Paper text:
Histone H2A.Z, one of the most widely distributed histone variants among eukaryotes, is reportedly involved in many biological processes, such as transcriptional regulation, genome stability, chromosome segregation, cellular proliferation, heterochromatin organization and epigenetic memory regulation, probably by modification of the chromatin structure. Two non-allelic isoforms, H2A.Z.1 and H2A.Z.2, exist in vertebrates, and a splicing variant, H2A.Z.2.2, is also expressed from the H2A.Z.2 gene as a minor or tissue-specific transcript. In the nucleosome, two of each of the histones H2A, H2B, H3 and H4 form the histone octamer and about 145–147 base pairs of DNA are wrapped around it. In the present study, we determined the crystal structures of human nucleosomes containing H2A.Z.1 and H2A.Z.2, and discovered a structural polymorphism in the L1 loop regions.
Human H2A.Z.1 and H2A.Z.2 differ by only three amino acids. The structural polymorphism and distinct dynamics of H2A.Z.1 and H2A.Z.2 may be caused by the amino-acid difference at position 38, which is serine in H2A.Z.1 and threonine in H2A.Z.2. The H2A.Z.1 Ser38 and H2A.Z.2 Thr38 residues sit at the C-­terminal edge of the α1 helix, which is located just before the L1 loop. Therefore, this amino-acid difference may directly affect the neighbouring L1 loop structure. The structures of the L1 loop regions were found to clearly differ between H2A.Z.1 and H2A.Z.2, although their amino-acid sequences in this region are identical. In the present study, we found that the H2A.Z.1 and H2A.Z.2 L1 loop regions are quite flexible. The structures of the H2A.Z.1 and H2A.Z.2 L1 loops may bend to avoid a steric clash with the canonical H2A L1 loop in heterotypic nucleosomes. The present study revealed that in nucleosomes within living cells H2A.Z.1 is more rapidly exchanged than H2A.Z.2. However, in vitro there is no obvious difference in the stabilities of the reconstituted H2A.Z.1 and H2A.Z.2 nucleosomes, as revealed by a salt-resistance assay. In mice, H2A.Z.1 gene knockout causes lethality, although the H2A.Z.2 gene is still present, indicating that H2A.Z.1 plays unique roles.
Numbering used by the authors:
A (entry chain G): 17 to 120
B (entry chain A): 38 to 134
C (entry chain B): 25 to 102
D (entry chain H), E (entry chain D): 32 to 124
F (entry chain C): 15 to 120
G (entry chain F): 19 to 102
H (entry chain E): 37 to 134
DNA sequence: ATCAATATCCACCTGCAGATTCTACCAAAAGTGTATTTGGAAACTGCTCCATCAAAAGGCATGTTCAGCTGAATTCAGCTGAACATGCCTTTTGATGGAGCAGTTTCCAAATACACTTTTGGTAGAATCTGCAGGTGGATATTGAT
DNA sequence: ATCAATATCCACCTGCAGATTCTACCAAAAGTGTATTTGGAAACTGCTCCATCAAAAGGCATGTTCAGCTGAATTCAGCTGAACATGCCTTTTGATGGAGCAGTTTCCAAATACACTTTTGGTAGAATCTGCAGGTGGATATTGAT
């Protein structure tokens, strides 16, 4: 019967709503579906990151996604890189050395 | 005997460290500095180890990026060596000044 | 204490940042910068600590501070 | 003494897109910070939108416009699709 | 339909500091933008502070911390003074 | 009789209006203390005063009686703290005159 | 009405030069004017894209100065003097 | 005589001049046209408060002027005096724009 | 580009422990079901304000010429910063405590939200008041050629 | 050094667009006396934080040697700035129609607000495991030198 099930999402529509009722100022309300919509958004973007990161880990012969993988997935992707100007702790940087700095 | 030409070990270190994710500042000196800086804002403070680690991560991320922009400024100037005027230019364009 | 932030460690940071050759004056410069950074962040953090009437700077204090400095960090509570 | 986290749901989504792949605690941490960040961004923009237009309810329309505003195109297209799909399916049953 | 402003009060304060000096409409416009801006920021930081400390109410204590973040150095010291002072004056009925 | 809360606080800025704007921001789902409006009105007033002080001076320096956006810009860019606090764009403010040494004739 | 095309070239070389002059620039390479146009288009696109998104959200056909002010705030290019 | 200012003297006059003034530097009508053209390629049948066009021009000119200041710094840093696309790119990159 | 040697890096495979993933019972949200409350959508429409048109005039953009000096290329040597092996201290680690103190309760006064009835203060205009934009003309530079 | 050529001032002048000031009610402020909470205030648990300690092993600080980078000096092709002729198109003044905001109403569909009944996610305990970090030994890379 859960709204997450009804919406066909893994993410918690109910919790998302309970969190949204703390953003509507005073005298503020939240649509029945805003919770569903946001839940969907969060789930989708989580899926996108998790996919790219799992790829980075398969291409690295490991089973567990680490933060390095998360970093490689984010920075390796134009859109994710654009959206996530956070700092992934323990992700390091992407290897890159400038042309003019190499020998001969 | 045997000796590497200047620049070679450098490039080797660049490869190595760009490969790893480890903190490059030693933990205790850093903690010590954090504590001393903080002492001047509120006295007898304690720190979650997570807070010191957050600080150190934030720092090293910051200094690494800043070094990237700095290196770019040195390359603008047809150099290969970064100088304080490079860090200065970088920080200005960033609006940190 | 700031001098405790050693030349070879700053070398390491530069290296990860793709730097091949380092001027002698870079280390003092880097220290100054790192000090301003830590000052700006800790000040804010501790302000959150004191507002929460605590004697203990929490990681969340640092995370909130970092977020205010537009230096958002992932992995410690947000 | 409870402390809610998106860990469970992240893990679930992981198992859908990569049933073979696991996740470290630090990584799971990043994922949390990610979800919280984006949630706060969306929520913020949505409340702002409703304000600008002198509304009091945050509807899915605020959520959607906010998504257009926050997410770079393509991520935004797909996010809009997912959102509308979730909502239709939810409104049918 | 009346739409509010800060012009009346900017103007008062103006006459207080430089009683000889006028302000052009565009300047007043900037001033209004300035005030609504800093108001926004203070309110925002305050609501966040309240959130972080499981508190449902925003008090002078919130505003004061908000002002300590936000405002640099001397501005902050003087602002705190003026606020604290206005508040103690206001309480002593 | 009725004393306004602004008067009660010794302020030119509107404590009531500001309290209303804080109720409507807001919390969310929460409440605003009696003093928060006062403390806010006081900060906003103080800063309007700091700005108007510096601007007014600039207006004097240019032998004019009436503050324009240019003046506001001179005052804000001229002061380290206002300049830090205010990274807005001031429509009609122009820039502060500044040429680099290297550009100047040898 | 009438087809709109190449209006970026409306941003004349002398106007760009003036802008660099306020920007404190003494000497200007011939390749600046096209670069600048490039940059201006991107800037404008982004702001307008957001502004219109606000317009559309409000079910309006007219882009208001408020739409641009919100747009600008989003881009972190906050503007004083139109916000009211 | 005839009479010529040496190359760079007028340029400096213009820096002083425009640094002194505050009026918009791009001609108003062409700018409007650019705005309408860009908007149109996003949503047809749009209208603009004149106010909105002006807000945009203010924002844009402020933007270009600051950008040129940064660019001018990169030129100087390169021990030059002529700004080049190189510089604008260096500035925008460091500004974290591109 | 080879002939050597010194070191670096790279794959394959290995074995345990620090981290996982997996399992198992109690509070605190999430869903149901009923009864108001209310926001803001649908519908007339008053009425700013936007697009368009017209037309005249000079402020500017455009294009060309011509040569000054700037960027870019080259060469070069002083000296800075890298590589390195040498010698030692400070960071790192890891069980112990002790204890400071974040977090959790369990509780009444202070403090906030209400909900109605007056009592102003601010706002949208009319209506007076004046800065100053913008046009002068000579005093004082400021430049650049002999 | 000069003067000659222009540009830059700086101050005086004055009616006009733009302020500052005078005027009428609606919305919003203040004063009431109900109602509800909330957060602070104490008194105590447990986590997790500081502080020694007592060391191996790192990792840093040191002085040598010199390779190679930076910067200084010097040339020059030609890009870009200054000036000029020419005339387009932006600017400025004004009016027109009508699109479209935006100010009002009336009021279903959707939201809140209870009060219950279940359900699930957080916790702190168990049962595997991924892969770190360490082995070869095998090519690669780098640097001196046919």
């Amino acid at each position: 019967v859960s709204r997450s099930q009804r919406a066909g999402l893994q993410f918690p529509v109910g919790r998302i709503h309970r969190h949204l009722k703390s953003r509507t100022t005073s005298h503020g309300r939240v649509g029945a579906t805003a919770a569903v919509y946001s839940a969907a958004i969060l789930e989708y973007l989580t899926a996108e990151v998790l996919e790219l990161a799992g790829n980075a880990s398969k291409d690295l012969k490991v089973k567990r996604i680490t933060p390095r993988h998360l970093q490689l997935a984010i920075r390796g992707d134009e859109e994710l890189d654009s959206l996530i100007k956070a700092t992934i702790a323990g992700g390091g940087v992407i290897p890159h050395i400038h042309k003019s700095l190499i020998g001969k | 005997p045997h000796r590497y030409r200047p620049g070679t070990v450098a490039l080797r270190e660049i490869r190595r460290y760009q490969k790893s994710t480890e903190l490059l500042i030693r933990k205790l000196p850093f903690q010590r500095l954090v504590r001393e800086i903080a002492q001047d804002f509120k006295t007898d403070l304690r720190f979650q180890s997570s807070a010191v680690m957050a600080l150190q991560e934030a720092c090293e991320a910051y200094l690494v990026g800043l070094f990237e922009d700095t290196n770019l400024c040195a390359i603008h100037a047809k150099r290969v060596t970064i100088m304080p005027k490079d860090i200065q230019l970088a920080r200005r364009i960033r609006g940190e000044r | 204490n700031i001098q405790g932030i050693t030349k070879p460690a700053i070398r390491r940071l530069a290296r990860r940042g793709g730097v091949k050759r380092i001027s002698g004056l870079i280390y003092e410069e880097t220290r100054g910068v790192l000090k301003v950074f830590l000052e700006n962040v800790i000040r804010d953090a501790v302000t959150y600590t004191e507002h929460a009437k605590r004697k203990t700077v929490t990681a969340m204090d640092v995370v909130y501070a970092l977020k205010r400095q537009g230096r958002t960090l992932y992995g410690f509570g947000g | 003494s409870r402390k809610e986290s998106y860990s469970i749901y992240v893990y679930k989504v992981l198992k859908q897109v990569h049933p073979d792949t696991g996740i470290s605690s630090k990584a799971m941490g990043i994922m949390n910070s990610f979800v919280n960040d984006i949630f706060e961004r969306i929520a913020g923009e949505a409340s702002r939108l409703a304000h600008y237009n002198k509304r009091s309810t945050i509807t899915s329309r605020e959520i959607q416009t906010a998504v257009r505003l926050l997410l770079p195109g393509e991520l935004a297209k797909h996010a809009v699709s997912e959102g509308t799909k979730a909502v239709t399916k939810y409104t049918s049953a």
